[model samples]
Target chain A: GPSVFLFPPKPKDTLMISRTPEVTCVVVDVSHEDPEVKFNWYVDGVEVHNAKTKPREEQYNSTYRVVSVLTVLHQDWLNGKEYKCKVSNKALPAPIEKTISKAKGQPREPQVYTLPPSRDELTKNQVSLTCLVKGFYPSDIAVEWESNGQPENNYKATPPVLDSDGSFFLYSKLTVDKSRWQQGNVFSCSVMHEALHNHYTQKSLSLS
Target chain B: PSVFLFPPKPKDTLMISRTPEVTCVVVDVKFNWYVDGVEVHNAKTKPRESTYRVVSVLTVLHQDWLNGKEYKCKPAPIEKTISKAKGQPREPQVYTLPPSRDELTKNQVSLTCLVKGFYPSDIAVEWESNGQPENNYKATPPVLDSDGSFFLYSKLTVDKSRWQQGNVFSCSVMHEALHNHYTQKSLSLS
Candidate 1:
C-alpha cells in the first residue's frame, strides 16, 4: 500500500519583516527520506537564483541532507510579493509546494473637519466661536488660530484630546475681545495632523 | 446618431453539475437507501430480478448525483418485524427585507432591518420608499460567518443641513422568507 503525508500539517510559525527599506531572507528546512528530493523557489511566478542545498553531519549517526540558501539580490522585488517553496521525490506522484506573501502596513491619510461660527455673525456683546475636527491617527496633532494666514496669539484654548479608537479629536474656541469684536474682524481655526490640514473661519461682531 | 452595441451574454445562467457519493456503515443492522422520498434499494435480503439491492461489501464506485435528487440512508433490524421512517421532507428557507423611505438632505435616517438566519444559502436585501422601491442604496449579500450565524447591513448618509433641523427617515428590509420587516431610527443634528 502507498501512503502520502504533508509536512508541517498544522499552521507553521510566521516571521514578521517590518521595515521601510525592503530586505529579503531565505528560509531553509531539512527533510530526511529514502528517495532524493529536489528544491525550488518561486516569486510571484518568476524564479530567483538565491537558493541551494547540501548534506551536513547528523547527530544520530544517520546521514542528513542540507538545503542550500540563495541570496535574493533585490528586497524590493519581494515587497508585496508572494514566494513559494516546492519539494519533490522521484517516488512521489506530484511535487508539494508551500507559499507565503509579504504584508504591508496601512498608510496615513488626512482627517476630516467642520468649520467654526464667526463672532461678527453673532448678535451678543460677548461672542464665542468654536471649530472641530475628528478622526486622526497618532494622537499628536496641532490646532492653531490664524489671523490673515498667520498664527494668532491672543486666543486661549486647550490641547486636543485622544479618542477611544486611538485617534485624536481637537477643538479650539476664540472669545471676542469686545473691542476686537466690534471691528468686524475674521478669525480662523486650523487643524494639522500628519500632513493633513483644515480650517474653519467666523467673522466677529458686537451689538453693544 | 446613437449606436447600440449588442450586449454580451449574461454569466448568471451558467449550469453546474456535481455528482457526490455517500457510503453507509451499520454496526449490527442492515441498511437501505432512498432517493427523493422513494426507496431505491435495500441491503438486507435479495429480491427478484425486478428489485435492486445495495451491495453488502461497499467499494469505491462512481455514482451520478444530480442537482434536484435527494440521497438518504436508513438502518433497520434484521428481525424482519419493522423499520424506522425512511425520509424527511425538504423545505428551502429564505430571508427578505422591508421597503425603504426617502429623506430630506441632512435629516436623521435609519436603515432597513434584515432577517436573522435561514437555509439553502440564497438571500438578498432591497429598499422601498413611500410605497415605491428605491435603487440608490447599496448593500452586501447575506454571508455565513465562521460560527454559522448570518447577518447583513445598510447605511443612510445624513444630509447635514436637513439633519441640523431634525427630520425622520425609515429603512425597510426584505427577505425571501418573511417578505418585509423594517426598522426606523431618527437623528437630530442640533
Candidate 2:
C-alpha cells in the first residue's frame, strides 16, 4: 500500500489599491512536489469572470508561493463590494477560500494643509500655493483647488508617494497672480479619501 | 447463522472504491440488508450455483464506508456483519513495455514496466520470470506529473539467451489504487 500524503496550501489574502485599479491578491504556499494548483475568484457569492493567477516566487523546503490577483473595478471596490479567492488542487478534496474588500485593511486619515507663498514670492508677478496631504493609507485619494470660492482647474497634483511609515502623501499646487494674493484672495484645497467619514476634508489659506 | 459474502478487506495501501458492494448467500431462505440499523431496500438477488442457493448484494457510497457504518445481512434470527477498513481511495494505472529484439541481438535485453497516475507515490514493483522472482532490475523514483499524479519506470535486465528461449517476464505492482491492491503486466518474445 502507498503512504498517506496530502498537499494542502496555506493561503494569505490582501487588497492593493491604486487610484483607477485595485487588485485583491491571494498568496498560497503549497508543496513544490505537487502538480499545478488552481485558483477561483468570486464577488459576493457569484464567480468572477476571467480571473488570473500567476506565480510570485519559489520557496525552500519544496514549497511554492503563488499569487492569484483579481482586478476589481475602482467603483466597485470603493463601494465596498466583497471579493473572494478560492484555491484548490488534486491533493485537496475541498478548496480553501478567503474573502476581502476595500474595507478590510487599515485606514490612515490624511492631514490637509494649504501653505501661502513666502513674503518675497508675494512681491513677484506670480506665486504658487501648495496643498500638502499626508499620512493616508491605501493611496486612494483626490486633491483639488478652489480660488475665491470658485473651482480652479489650473492646479497641478502629484501622484501619491509612499511614506516611510507605510502611509501615503501627495501635493497639489496652484498658481495665482501676486495681485490676487495681495488683495487677500482666498485659496482652498479639498481632499477626498476613503479614510474620511464625510469623504471630504479641506484647508483654506490667504495672504491676509 | 446466515452466510454473508462481505466485501473483501482492502490490501495494504489500497482503499475501498467509491462504490463498494456487500453480498450475502442464502440457503433455502431469503432476507434483506440493513446498514447502521437502517433497512436497505436497494439490494438485488440472483440464484447461485444450485436451486437452494441465492446471492444477494447491496451497494453503498464510499462516504458511508468512511463514516464506519456497520452493514448487516439478516434472516430472522441469523445474521452476518461487516464494517469499514483503513485507507483513502485513489486508483493507479500500470503499463508494461517489452524489450526490443535489436537489444537482444546485442546480448543485452531489458523489460520495462511503467506505473503511472498514482497518488501518495507509495508503491512497490517486483519482476517475475515464469512465476519466479528475479532481481536484475532498476526502478526510478516517483515523478510527479502536471495533473498531480505520480509515475515511475522499472526496467529488468536479462541475458540474451533468455530472450531466445522465449521467456515470459512480468512486473507486478502493489499500490492502494489497484482494485485488489495489486496489478501485473507481462511481456514475452514471440
Candidate 3:
C-alpha cells in the first residue's frame, strides 16, 4: 500500500479593507514560485475585466501587482459585499482566492457646537470658543475651528469621557485675538473622520 | 364506570439512628440525644430525683440513617458550619501624570505611572496639554507577560521654544468597564 498527500495548500495572503466609502487601491505581492501566474478580480462574485496590472522590472524579486482606483459609490455597497482577488497558474493544482469584507461606516454624524459670541473687542486680547460633537464611532476623529475664514490657533482638550459603547465625545477650544474679531470674523468648525471612505460632515457658526 | 384510589399514607414519625461519639456529664433533668431526626438507643425515658447523670457506652445500631445528612446538637436545629454573609466593595486606584516638557530646544523627557494587580490585561494611555486633549497619540499595543501582568509605555518630546512659552502635559490610563480611574503625573519645562 502507498500513502497519499494533498498538494498546493491555500495561498497565505492578507486582504485589506478601508473604512471610507471612497476609492480604494490594493497592492498584491506575487513574487512566489509559479511558472505561469494569472490575476483575476471580482466584485460581488462577478468578474471585473478593466482592472489594471503591471509586471515588475525584475523576475525573481519582481512580483508586485496592484488594482488601482477602485471606486465604491456608496458605503452600503461595501458593507456586506465581498471583494476578491484570485491568483492561478496553469502549472499549479488550483487557484487561490483572497477576499475581504468592508466594515460598516461609522453611524454618528460629526457635529460641532458653538458657544455665544463675545461682545468685547479690543487689540492684543484673547477670545476663546468651544466646540462639541458626538454620535460617532471609532472615537478617533478630527475637529478644527477656523477664524476669519482661516485656521486659528486651536487647542484640543482631553476627552470628557472614554467609552466602548460605540459612542465617542471630544472637545476642542480655539483662541484668537480680539482684533481679529473686531475686524469681523466668521468662525467655523469642521470634523474629518474615516478618510478611506469620503463621508465627512462640517458645521459653521458665525460670531459678530 | 370509574374507580378512585387514595394516595398511600404518609409516614407518621420517621425513625432514625444516632451515635454518641463523645461522653457528656449532665446536671439537668431533660436530657436530649438527637442525631439526624433519629434518637439514640440508650436515651433515658425518665429521670430520678438525686444526682449526676452520665450517658455511658451509648452506640448506634445503624450508621446508614445518618449517611448524607448534617447533625446539630442544640435545643433547635441550626447550621453547624460558618457561611459568608456579604461582599466587599471594589475601590478604584487611579492616578494622573503632570504634563512633560514640549519646547523644541529642550531635551526630551519621559514620565511613568505604574498600576498593579489588574485583571484581563487591556489598558489605554492618553495625553493632554493645558487641559486640552491632543490628537490620538500613537501607542504600542499592550503586551502581556507570562506572569499574567501587563506593561504599557508612551513617549513625549519637548522643544526649547515650546518649553520657554510654557505648556501643560499630562497622561492617564483607562480600563474597559471602569473608565478614567487613572493615576496622573505632570512636568512643566521652561
Candidate 4:
C-alpha cells in the first residue's frame, strides 16, 4: 500500500534542433531512487518501443541518475509536418514536449502585388504597369514581366530595398504604349518566390 | 538611396592610446573608465521629477587609462547602422572650460569642464591652467541626453588666490571626430 511518486521529473531543456533538420531530446537526469517512478518515450504522437539503445542509467552515491535520448532522422523531419519528443513520467501531471516545426525549414515567403505607379492618379501615356513585391524573407526573388502575353524586359526595376521588417521589397516597371494601354489590352506580372506555395504567382491587368 | 562616393564605409574602429609618449594624469570615476585625455561609461533613467535629466561623463586621465594600450571612438553600432542606413553619421562633439574663482573670496577656483553632444560615448576633456596640461579631477558617469548624444562633467579645484594680470585657465577636448576635435573655454579676470 505504498505508492508515493508525487514529484514531477524534469526533461532536459537543452533540446537541440539543427538546421540540417534533425532533433535530439535528452531528458534531464532523474533520480532512480523511487521504485514507483517510470519513464516513457514518445515521438510524433505515439509511444516509442523496440528501442535500439536503452536510456543511460548511472548510480552516484545512494542515488541513481537516468538519462534518455530520442533522435529523428533528417528525411523523416522533412517529410513530417512536425517533429516532437515527449517524456511521460508518473511524477508529472502532463508530459514534457519539445518540438520543431517542419515549416520552420523555410522562412515565410513574400506577399507579392502588381502595383500601378500611382493609383490615386494615372495618365494614359505614363502609367506603366508596376510590379511591387513585398514581404518574403532571406531576400531572394525573381520577377518577370509580360505584355500582350509576351515576355518583356526593362531596367526600370529598382534594387531590392529593406522594408524595415528585415524582409525585402522590390519593383519592376513595364511601360506600355499610351495608345495600346488606353485601348484596353491585357498585361501580366509573375513572381517566382518560394512562399508562393505553388512556387509562382502571376497577376494580370486588362484594359477593356 | 543616398550613396556615398566612398561607398558608405563600414564605421572603422579607432585606436588611440594614452598620449603614447607622454605620461598623462589619471582621474577617478565609478564605472570602468580609462582616458588618455578622458574616459567614459553609460548611465540611465527617464523623464521624471528629480529624475535628473543629468548627462554626466567621467574623464579619468591615465585615470583608468584604457589600460595604457589604445583607445579610439567613432560612435556606437546601432546608431552607426541607423546613420549608415540613412547616409551620414554625425561625429561626437566636445567643449571644455577651466575652474572659476569662488564668489567673493575669489581665491579658490575649480576646474569645470563639460563635454556635450558626443557619440560612441567615449570622450576625453582636456584642461590647461596657464597653458599646460592639467590633470586631477573627479567625473560622473557618461549620461545620455533625451536625444541620445552623451555629455560629461569634470571639475578640478585650485587656488586662484594669487592672481596674475594675464594668467589664463582653459579647457579643451579630444575625440575621433573633428579634424582637430579640440574645443576650449577660459577666463582672465581683469
Give the whole-model CA lDDT for all candidates, comma-separated. 0.38, 0.65, 0.42, 0.45
lDDT tens digits by residue: candidate 1, B26-73:
331345555555666533332212433232221111121213344455
Write candidate 2's Cα lDDT for B100-158 as tens digits: 33344556565666565687666788899866898666666666554566666666768
DockQ of 2: 0.00
**Candidate 3 local Cα displacement, residue B121, angstroms:** 21
Q: B54-96, model 4: which lDDT tens digit per residue?
A: 2222222332232233332212211101111221224544323
lDDT-better candidate, 2 vs 3: 2
lDDT for each residue of candidate 3 in B110-137, tens digit (9 for 90 to 100): 3223232244344456676777765434
Docking class of 3: incorrect
- Docking quality class, candidate 1: incorrect
Candidate 2 pairs with clashing backbones:
A1-B12, A1-B13, B13-B176, B14-B176
- Which parts of model 2 are misplaced by more than 4 Å? A1-42, A47-104, B1-190
Best candidate, TM-score = 3
- Runs with alpha carbons beyond 4 Å of true place in candidate 4: A1-22, A35-55, A59-63, A71-73, A102-208, B1-55, B59-64, B68-190
TM-score of each: 0.29, 0.31, 0.35, 0.28
- The segments of candidate 3 whose C-alpha lies over 4 angstroms from its true place after superposition are A1-29, A32-37, A54-68, A75-79, A89-96, A109-111, A115-130, A138-165, A172-182, A192-201, A205-208, B1-190
- Superposed on the true interface residues, model 1 gives a C-alpha RMSD in angstroms of 19.9
Candidate 2 vs candidate 3: which has greater DockQ?
3
